[PDB]
Amino acid sequence: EQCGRQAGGKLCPNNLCCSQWGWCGSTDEYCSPDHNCQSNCKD
């Protein structure tokens, strides 16, 4: 995993959103509070 709880709090590179799964990306499944985004979220 790249980020988030699964990776002991690592932030994503390039301002990317950390999904609930601990991976980095820029679309809704990564960024939405409705999908429990962990960091750099779209709110």
| Residue 38: φ, ψ to 5° | -95, -30
The set of residues, in sequence order, having a beta carbon less than 8 Å from that of 27 and lying 6+ positions away, is: none
17 membership: H or E segment, kind and range: strand 17-18
Secondary structure (DSSP) of 2-13: -SBGGGTTBPPS
Residue 31 sits in which domain range? Answer: 1-43
Task: Determine how β-strand 17-18 pairs with β-strand 24-25.
Answer: antiparallel
DSSP 42: -
The method of structure determination was: X-ray
Domain count of the chain? 1
Query: In Å, how far are 24, 28, 32 from 13, measured between CA atoms?
Result: 8, 17, 18
- Resolution (Å units): 1.4
CATH number, domain of 6, equals 3.30.60.10
Q: How many residues appear in the chain?
A: 43
The alpha-helical segments, DSSP class H, found in 1-43 are 28-31
